[PDB]
Amino acid sequence: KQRVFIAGHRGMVGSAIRRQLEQRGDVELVLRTRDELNLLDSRAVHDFFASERIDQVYLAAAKVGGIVANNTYPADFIYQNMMIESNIIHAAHQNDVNKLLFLGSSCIYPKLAKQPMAESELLQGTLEPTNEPYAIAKIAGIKLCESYNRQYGRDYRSVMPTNLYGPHDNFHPSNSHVIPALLRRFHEATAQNAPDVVVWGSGTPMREFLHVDDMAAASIHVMELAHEVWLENTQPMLSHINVGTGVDCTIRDLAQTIAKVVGYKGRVVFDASKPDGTPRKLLDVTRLHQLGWYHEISLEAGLASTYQWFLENQ
Amino acid sequence: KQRVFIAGHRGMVGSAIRRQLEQRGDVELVLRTRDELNLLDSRAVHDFFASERIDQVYLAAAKVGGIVANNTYPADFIYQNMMIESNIIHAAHQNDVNKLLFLGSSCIYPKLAKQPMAESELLQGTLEPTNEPYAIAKIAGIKLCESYNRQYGRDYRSVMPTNLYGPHDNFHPSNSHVIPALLRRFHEATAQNAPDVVVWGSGTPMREFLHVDDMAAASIHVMELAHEVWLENTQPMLSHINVGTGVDCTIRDLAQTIAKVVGYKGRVVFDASKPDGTPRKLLDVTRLHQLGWYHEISLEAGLASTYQWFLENQ
Ligand SMILES: NC(=O)C1=CN([C@@H]2O[C@H](COP(=O)(O)OP(=O)(O)OC[C@H]3O[C@@H](n4cnc5c(N)ncnc54)[C@H](OP(=O)(O)O)[C@@H]3O)[C@@H](O)[C@H]2O)C=CC1
Numbered sequence: 001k002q003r004v005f006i007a008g009h010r011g012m013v014g015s016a017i018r019r020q021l022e023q024r025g026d027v028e029l030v031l032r033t034r035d036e037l038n039l040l041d042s043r044a045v046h047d048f049f050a051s052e053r054i055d056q057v058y059l060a061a062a063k064v065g066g067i068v069a070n071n072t073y074p075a076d077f078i079y080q081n082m083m084i085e086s087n088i089i090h091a092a093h094q095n096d097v098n099k100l101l102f103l104g105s106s107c108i109y110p111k112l113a114k115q116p117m118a119e120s121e122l123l124q125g126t127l128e129p130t131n132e133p134y135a136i137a138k139i140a141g142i143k144l145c146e147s148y149n150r151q152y153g154r155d156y157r158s159v160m161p162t163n164l165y166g167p168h169d170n171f172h173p174s175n176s177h178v179i180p181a182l183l184r185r186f187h188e189a190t191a192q193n194a195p196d197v198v199v200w201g202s203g204t205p206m207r208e209f210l211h212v213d214d215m216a217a218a219s220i221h222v223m224e225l226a227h228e229v230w231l232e233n234t235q236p237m238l239s240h241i242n243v244g245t246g247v248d249c250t251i252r253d254l255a256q257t258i259a260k261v262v263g264y265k266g267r268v269v270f271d272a273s274k275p276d277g278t279p280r281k282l283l284d285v286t287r288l289h290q291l292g293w294y295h296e297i298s299l300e301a302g303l304a305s306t307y308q309w310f311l312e313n314q
Numbered sequence: 315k316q317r318v319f320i321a322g323h324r325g326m327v328g329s330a331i332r333r334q335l336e337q338r339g340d341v342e343l344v345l346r347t348r349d350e351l352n353l354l355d356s357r358a359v360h361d362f363f364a365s366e367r368i369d370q371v372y373l374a375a376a377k378v379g380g381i382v383a384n385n386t387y388p389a390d391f392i393y394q395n396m397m398i399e400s401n402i403i404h405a406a407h408q409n410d411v412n413k414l415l416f417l418g419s420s421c422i423y424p425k426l427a428k429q430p431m432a433e434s435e436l437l438q439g440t441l442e443p444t445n446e447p448y449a450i451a452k453i454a455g456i457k458l459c460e461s462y463n464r465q466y467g468r469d470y471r472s473v474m475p476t477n478l479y480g481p482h483d484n485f486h487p488s489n490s491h492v493i494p495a496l497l498r499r500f501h502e503a504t505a506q507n508a509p510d511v512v513v514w515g516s517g518t519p520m521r522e523f524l525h526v527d528d529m530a531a532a533s534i535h536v537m538e539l540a541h542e543v544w545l546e547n548t549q550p551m552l553s554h555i556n557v558g559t560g561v562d563c564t565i566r567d568l569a570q571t572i573a574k575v576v577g578y579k580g581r582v583v584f585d586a587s588k589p590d591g592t593p594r595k596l597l598d599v600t601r602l603h604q605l606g607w608y609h610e611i612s613l614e615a616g617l618a619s620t621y622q623w624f625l626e627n628q
């Protein structure tokens with residue numbers, strides 16, 4: 001019975017890992033809340049690892065936010081994220097935890113990466129300024145992992161998720177994330193008999209989305225591969241693994257699909273007088289597939305089940 | 315032995331015509347696949363008609379889709395549909411094909427047409443925006459037919475089918491079409507012991523449905539009438555003929571009937587918190603009946619046989 005610490009087990013991503021893990025008898029989960037354990041406090045973090053007998057660590061605690069937040073508190077996003085990751089990785093090594101899964105993010109790739117983005121696009125160029133501090137912290141996280149793997153022979157692996165969505169997301173039309181923002185918007189419009197819902201932009205830009213439950217499955221699959229197979233499929237200084245569908249879908253498709261999911265009968269409208277972002281953004285998931293993992297939830301299916309959760313929890 | 319080209323003979327509607335025609339010794343069927351013949355390519359289309367010695371054409375090829383698709387690719391639905399119909403009708407005339415059956419669609423009528431909708435409701439007012447591009451292409455199709463009939467004395471006839479269903483439909487709860495969407499939904503729920511199945515809406519709205527095999531019979535009956543009887547029953551600038559049952563049935567009736575067809579023992583539930591569409595939508599089929607054709611398949615019978623096909627092909 002392996003002893004698994006899922007840091008930030010109540011976050012969106014962490015809680016999803018916890019659900020799957022929970023049905024595993026070959027696993028004993030060790031969890032703490034932020035009040036039970038502040039991950040910024042090194043001593044505390046060190047004490048925990050020095051007293052709990054941990055075998056694996058899923059590093060899902062982070063200071064995450066939307067466009068307004070990233071732009072409003074840039075110091076918090078870089079600092080907290082650097083400490084949380086430094087504290088954990090270090091304490092783990094010191095207590096001889098040999099297995100860890102680090103979580104990155106698609107938004108760590110350069111602003112003009114070649115699409116679809118392979119793992120080798122990392123660090124190839126300038127970052128999006130809104131995400132820059134946060135990105136830097138994340139990349140630092142990955143390079144810590146590779147470094148310990150290199151110097152000490154540890155097994156600290158990494159996955160770069162695409163845009164995610166699902167239960168426990170922040171469902172506010174206040175949120176900078178389209179799915180939760182849109183699920184909420186179409187919901188309210190549907191309830192108020194809104195004759196239309198307007199979305200800034202042409203709707204032509206292409207994006208990628210992944211249900212958080214696939215993300216969780218993919219993480220555990222990656223964590224649990226044999227070391228030899230994982231090495232075969234990575235390089236020690238290019239160790240991460242993209243996680244996504246590798247499939248595009250326009251914002252228009254997304255919006256109209258959401259509209260249909262919510263039972264909205266008004267008109268979806270695009271205000272093209274508003275600028276679009278880049279035309280295309282998506283991960284190349286060749287590595288993942290080669291390691292034998294393929295996502296299971298259709299957007300359509302995932303959005304439907306995600307809306308019911310919102311319904312069951314508003 | 316009349317030489318019959320059924321364009322798009324593998325589509326839902328085309329394949330149904332082909333089945334009935336197949337048992338006719340007075341007919342020689344000429345068929346091509348999309349790879350054997352792209353109908354968007356005029357030259358190709360022209361070459362075909364210039365080398366095959368055709369007597370009748372059943373125009374069943376089209377770019378058809380659901381609500382999300384119509385809303386996501388409006389250019390494809392108007393363009394492809396205009397070309398396919400232009401190419402065929404033109405090549406046929408040029409090679410002296412005198413007989414053709416054009417297929418329209420109930421969704422071409424105005425949003426607020428008077429119910430039940432007689433053929434004279436066409437063009438009387440605004441269209442449903444979701445279907446607008448597609449509708450325009452279809453109406454253009456009909457007016458091409460009437461135009462050639464008028465200028466050149468051809469015999470290019472038209473039928474406007476109601477909502478259809480049957481073998482070879484797209485059976486996905488992913489599909490914007492209730493019968494296939496519901497047949498699939500009740501099937502899965504029945505298999506998973508789902509305690510209930512929820513359908514957005516009150517269930518009070520009235521709609522019309524026709525089994526694709528009746529549609530096929532009705533088309534051939536219409537194609538094969540004598541010109542004189544057909545003229546007697548139409549006007550050259552109001553030539554189409556509605557095809558349906560002319561009978562209403564509520565969504566509630568539909569759902570509960572499907573539930574019973576699939577052997578579902580859970581609860582059918584309506585979420586009236588979701589909006590309904592118009593209260594009533596159906597064709598006036600007085601013309602058809604006057605021309606002596608009356609549908610044969612009960613909804614109940616048609617749904618049963620349609621579910622078995624799905625069972626034999628999932
Ligand atoms: N598209 C995206 O958002 C994706 C992000 N991820 C990865 O997962 C990470 C988290 O994402 P997500 O699950 O959405 O975020 P959540 O915010 O939903 O989860 C983060 C969790 O960390 C906990 N946490 C943060 N700081 C501390 C701390 N000092 N001590 C203890 N607990 C703390 C939070 O608790 P509390 O609220 O109590 O502060 C929360 O439960 C991201 O950083 C990213 O790399 C992966 C895939 C996609």
Ligand SMILES: NC(=O)C1=CN([C@@H]2O[C@H](COP(=O)(O)OP(=O)(O)OC[C@H]3O[C@@H](n4cnc5c(N)ncnc54)[C@H](OP(=O)(O)O)[C@@H]3O)[C@@H](O)[C@H]2O)C=CC1
Pocket residue numbers: 321322323324325326327328347348351352353354374375376377378398417418419475476477478529
């Ligand atoms: N309720 C409804 O849906 C009804 C529709 N109809 C009429 O029948 C039409 C078709 O409906 P349906 O049978 O459901 O549709 P299908 O999509 O099932 O059939 C259309 C067929 O057209 C073929 N086709 C399309 N484009 C081309 C092309 N460029 N070259 C050659 N083949 C092509 C398709 O082949 P491929 O997939 O290989 O692209 C397919 O076999 C509708 O447009 C409508 O007017 C009539 C009654 C009801």
